[PDB]
Design a protein around this ligand. Structure first.
Ligand code: HEC
Ligand code: HEC
Ligand code: HEC
Ligand SMILES: C[C@H](CCC(=O)O)[C@H]1CC[C@H]2[C@@H]3CC[C@@H]4C[C@H](O)CC[C@]4(C)[C@H]3C[C@H](O)[C@]12C
Length: 71
């Protein structure tokens, strides 16, 4: 399957899966989550534990606006 881009108005956000599969061997951080997680994602989650928050906790991955968002 392919990577996906989240179409944030301020600039596309790429989500590269391979880097995540390699750096986050605890797959249950994202997979086998209960129902509602597809509907639930948005800016709040993304800037929280959905994206940015995990990068901060694990001490790796982009945490600056222009590192995630790029036109
Ligand atoms: C969130 C940060 C994730 C972590 C950690 C892991 N995966 Fe993942 N996976 C995630 C998304 C958003 C998607 C779909 C979008 C995409 O970029 O592919 C996936 C997809 C998979 C797939 C399908 C991949 C393919 O067919 O090319 C598999 C098999 C998969 N995920 C498994 C997997 C495993 C085993 C992980 C731990 C080592 C793992 N993922 C981490 C989100 C996230
Ligand atoms: C943990 C549960 C994570 C979640 C949820 C998300 N990311 Fe992540 N990401 C995580 C780690 C530990 C790393 C470092 C990987 C490395 O080897 O550098 C990353 C990395 C990225 C990257 C850069 C990948 C690279 O090749 O350097 C990007 C662009 C990125 N992450 C984006 C991203 C987005 C958009 C997420 C939410 C949709 C997201 N990540 C979630 C850990 C975790
Ligand atoms: C990755 C770890 C991110 C960082 C660092 C920042 N943002 Fe972000 N943002 C990210 C994603 C994956 C999304 C999309 C959420 C979704 O619905 O899929 C967003 C969203 C925004 C938005 C809203 C865009 C829209 O609703 O169309 C804005 C205005 C925004 N982001 C701005 C922004 C700024 C200023 C940041 C630095 C302070 C920043 N983001 C960090 C992922 C990530
Ligand atoms: C559920 C995990 C981990 C965050 C959490 O604990 O809530 C998060 C991390 C990244 C999230 C995905 C990012 C890309 C997609 C955004 C869409 O708008 C909704 C479906 C997807 C596929 C999201 C589904 C789910 O919301 C994920 C996999």
């Amino acid at each position: 399957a392919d990577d996906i881009v989240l179409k944030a108005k301020n600039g596309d956000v790429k989500f590269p899966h391979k880097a995540h599969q390699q750096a986050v061997p605890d797959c249950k951080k994202c997979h086998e989550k209960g129902p509602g997680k597809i509907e639930g994602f948005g800016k709040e989650m993304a800037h929280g534990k959905g994206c940015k928050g995990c990068h901060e906790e694990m001490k790796k991955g982009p945490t600056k606006c222009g590192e995630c968002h790029k036109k």
